[PDB]
């Protein structure tokens, strides 16, 4: 049998398989156990290291998906089942993958960590736009990815309990993060240079990590996609939580912290799911019922206190945004809304269609909003009006909250690199008005349009390699910038003065200056004043 | 009479008057300086409604301008044009109650459209007699026939004790009413036609010619109106009865005058100086763009708040001439912001930009404040000087002028009438302000009134044509309603100003540019949401 698939980790023997990337082989071993399975009464509990075992472990597929809410609004799809589980539902989940060169690294390779977004109620690593080969075949780098439970199995919580502490899934991460560190010297990878990245929810969790010390000595550098720990939706206060959770047993028929999650725990993982939507407060998009806690232990604080007063010094970023972050959110409840017509919508429907995307907003709050985006050369034009609701979408809970985080980790100290995302796949079969949808950056990054079969064009095949490069780069230094090319123009870091950031498209990268300055002065500036009276 | 010019000789209801030959450039023009128009408002009739002049005997000589009304003189930069050129240059007297009349020379043939000029001065002092409202350019150019008034200002103008028979409030607008009943009346002796009569006036000037199209009883006197630089909506031309009737029981007790009755016969004791020497004393907050003495909500001239009355209104055969200066903040800002002078670059911090903004909207709350600061905070760069200088100017522009004009053309054109807005954006090369001031309130009216035909003013070549424009363009709307010329489709043309597209023109030496949106979205923020936000 091939020595190259041969793999002896502390928990025993590992065979993984020889797979195909358009330029030449990898070597990728699927669905290997770091903790042992959250099932029974393991449910809502902190994960535990895996036991050993004998023998050698097939690490040839892809393991089960965590179980999790699947997606129903177009059914036969490609554009929202290419985010659907491709895998079996089950609560025993939690496994990671491995992609590394064939052969396995002469010298120790940096580590790229790929954690999923989702909301935090879905996703998996075996999808396929988060296939690991070509980053791995291309650019040498051992690439892992996890598993890590969601929804109510991963942030169900009560709040001081022994039983549901909240965060479990992060603390998934984190133990597939101390597994890398125990085992990943083995595969070729080297522990000293970690970089975790990560989209939407995933950008989030790499947020969280960065702002909890035990998660510290685990990583090196990071990088957010459309996402923050801070902002509206990616976490929830304890007060909030135990509400929530609360709310959910009542509606499963449960019934004491300890007597309450003792029949959550003997109810059939579908019986929570189904209810799991009913928990929200208020009719809204980009909200999720079950995300990170404020608990005071995983998070000291909250998010927006701790990178106000943190100390950031040797820490690397790269963070950025596509250009229409709200477009996809608006089909899932918005009336006027869908992906079969060009959404053209009233001056009525935009003011009923804040309210739902500023779900918290007073109505003096939302008039703000309103007042903000119109534009009042053509207050009632629908084109306008339906461009308008997805950027109040997109800067309100992506935008403004990465630019938010951006300046304060800069001025904290961090080494920053921003960017904007401008390019439409041409492959893309959501509708033109939607533009460049959160999400859409992913393919590319993890060099998708490599594969023939996938029907990309030539120039998006070299546009993909160049954010290979970067991403890689990135990962290696801390700085983006090709070491070798010495006519690019550069990608300067992010500061509070200057401010600048670089879009990527099929042009070379042009630098800007100021992310929505105005705009988000509104949102991160005056908002908050209002709502505080 | 007998071996006198007997072109300058005409009668009038009150009797006989004799005029003077005066030279424009281009030849000469008759004029009738201080005609009396009212009974002098002094002693018992001081803070009363005027009474029409009684009849003279005898010709009354008309060929000198008369009394400025009492008023504050401004001691801030002693010597220097920019203020002087505002400052009364007449003697000051309670008995001020004049007007002037220019004509061609001869007088015209035909009834000829009549232009009535309303002088600004934020209420509380101007005159008709300054010079660059000298009415013989147009006279002369245009062959129009022109009339100004003295009106009374500050305190003897516009102090009220709403409800009281001696102090209704109002009697500086209800002077300029009765002016234009003298009109009506008498304009057709000099060869005016009653029929075709445009008001326009700057500043409060411009507030008051608005008042006059919101008051039924001035809209028999007049077909036409422009309003330069104000609005009679917004923050500064009207205050309401309560605070009214609290300034003038504050100046009361700070000259001597501890019912109402008793009150105002105290103050009808005081001499004049002492009224105008504590007329500042009054303002609530310290403030820029604020005067104590101004027309009153008192039920009666004005039925509600002009706000309320230009959304409600039926304006349908109305048409009107609205605009801005470019820079309509930046005279305010040496008259109180720390950090400001005429005399130097006036480049301020951050703090200071703070502290302005409290100043330049004074009735703001803390919240309001931040709002206004942080919508006209450059946030790439905060703080910038240069920025911080220029913005502090365009909050106080905004909040005092430009948005209380976009929301006038905006109403009154969704109401029926014909509206033509414009921004007028250049700076004339004879300015002794700071080049940082910009174009500042007040300094189209030199233009418009053809200041550059007089060639000892020293006004470059392309001033003297750019200015002849203008009064073509003013004098085309008195006639006909429309600015642009039937004889010059060649030109590029001036659409009205609509709701729907919201065009309006630049005037500058180039040919007319066609805008669309009087700052529609720094409007929104002033005219729709700051209300909202006070109110909570
Ligand atoms: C992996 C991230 N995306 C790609 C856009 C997959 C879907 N997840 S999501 O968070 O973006 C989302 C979208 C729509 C409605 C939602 O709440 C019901 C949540
Ligand atoms: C020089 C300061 N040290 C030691 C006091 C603290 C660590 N500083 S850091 O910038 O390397 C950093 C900060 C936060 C999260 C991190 O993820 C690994 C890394
Ligand atoms: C003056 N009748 S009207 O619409 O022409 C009208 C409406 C209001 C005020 C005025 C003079 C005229
Ligand atoms: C009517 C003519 N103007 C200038 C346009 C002469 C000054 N008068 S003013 O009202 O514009 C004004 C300006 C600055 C500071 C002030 O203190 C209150 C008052
Ligand atoms: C688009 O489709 C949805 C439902 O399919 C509908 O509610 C909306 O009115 C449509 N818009 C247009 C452009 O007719
Ligand atoms: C300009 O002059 C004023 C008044 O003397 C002063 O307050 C301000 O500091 C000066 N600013 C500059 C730029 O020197
Ligand atoms: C015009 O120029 C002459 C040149 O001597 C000067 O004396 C005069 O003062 C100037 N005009 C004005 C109004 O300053």
Same mark, same amino acid.
């Given at each position: 049998?091939?020595?190259? *698939?041969?793999?002896? !980790? ?48 097939? &690490? ?14 177009? /059914? ?51 999808? @396929?736009?988060? =296939? ?63 970089? *975790? ?40 206060? &304890? ?34 799911? =189904? ?16 995300? /990170? ?20 010094? =040797? ?6 945004? !596509? ?33 739902? #995307?500023?779900?918290?907003?007073? @109505? ?30 997109? @800067? ?28 439409? &796949? ?65 990608? /300067?870091?992010?500061?509070?003065? &200057? ?14 200056? #100021? ?19």
């Amino acid at each position: 049998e091939d020595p190259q *698939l041969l793999v002896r !980790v502390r928990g025993g023997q590992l065979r993984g398989i020889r797979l195909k990337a358009p330029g030449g082989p990898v070597s990728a071993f699927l669905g290997i156990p770091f903790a042992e399975p959250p099932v029974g009464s393991r449910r809502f509990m902190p994960p535990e290291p895996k036991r050993p075992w004998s023998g050698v472990l097939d &690490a040839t597929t892809f393991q089960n998906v965590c179980y999790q809410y699947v997606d129903t609004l177009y /059914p036969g799809f490609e554009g929202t089942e290419m985010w659907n589980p491709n895998r079996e539902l089950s609560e025993d989940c939690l496994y990671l993958n491995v992609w590394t060169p064939y052969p396995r690294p002469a010298s120790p390779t940096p580590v790229l960590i790929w954690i999923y977004g989702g909301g935090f109620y879905s996703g998996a690593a075996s999808l @396929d736009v988060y =296939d690991g080969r070509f980053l791995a075949q291309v650019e040498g780098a051992v690439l892992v990815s996890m598993n890590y439970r969601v929804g109510t199995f991963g942030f169900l919580a009560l709040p001081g309990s022994r039983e549901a502490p909240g965060n479990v899934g992060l603390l998934d991460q984190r133990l597939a993060l101390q597994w890398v560190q125990e085992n990943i010297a083995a595969f070729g990878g080297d522990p000293m240079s970690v970089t *975790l990245f990560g989209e939407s929810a995933g950008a989030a969790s790499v947020g969280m990590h960065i702002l909890s010390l035990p998660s510290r000595s685990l990583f090196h550098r990071a990088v957010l996609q459309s996402g923050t720990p801070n902002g509206p939706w990616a976490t929830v206060s &304890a007060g909030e939580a135990r509400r929530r959770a609360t709310l959910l047993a009542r509606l499963v028929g449960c019934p004491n912290d300890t007597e309450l999650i003792a029949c959550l725990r003997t109810r059939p993982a579908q019986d929570l799911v =189904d209810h799991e939507w009913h928990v929200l407060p208020q009719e809204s998009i980009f909200r999720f019922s079950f995300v /990170p806690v404020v608990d005071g232990d995983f998070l000291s604080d909250t998010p927006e206190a701790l990178i106000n007063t943190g100390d950031f010094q =040797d820490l690397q970023v790269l963070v950025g945004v !596509v250009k229409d972050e709200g477009s996809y959110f608006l089909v899932y409840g918005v009336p006027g809304f869908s992906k079969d017509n060009e959404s053209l919508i009233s001056r009525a429907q935009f003011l009923a269609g804040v309210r739902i #995307g500023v779900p918290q907003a007073s @109505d003096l709050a939302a008039e703000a909003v309103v007042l903000h985006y119109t534009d009042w050369l053509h207050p009632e034009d629908p084109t306008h009006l339906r461009d308008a609701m997805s950027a109040v979408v997109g @800067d309100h809970n992506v935008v403004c909250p990465v630019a938010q985080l951006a300046g304060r980790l800069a001025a904290q100290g961090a080494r920053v690199y921003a960017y904007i995302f401008e390019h439409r &796949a041409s492959t893309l079969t959501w509708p033109l008005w939607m533009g460049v949808p959160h999400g859409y950056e992913i393919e590319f990054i993890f060099g998708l349009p490599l594969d023939p079969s996938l029907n990309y064009t030539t120039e998006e095949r070299i546009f993909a390699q160049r954010l290979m490069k970067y991403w890689t780069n990135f990962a290696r230094t801390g700085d983006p910038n090709d070491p070798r090319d010495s006519k690019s123009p550069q990608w /300067p870091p992010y500061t509070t003065a &200057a401010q600048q950031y670089v879009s990527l498209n099929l042009k070379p990268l042009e630098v800007r200056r #100021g992310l929505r300055a105005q705009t988000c002065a509104f949102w991160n500036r005056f908002l908050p004043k209002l709502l505080s009276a």
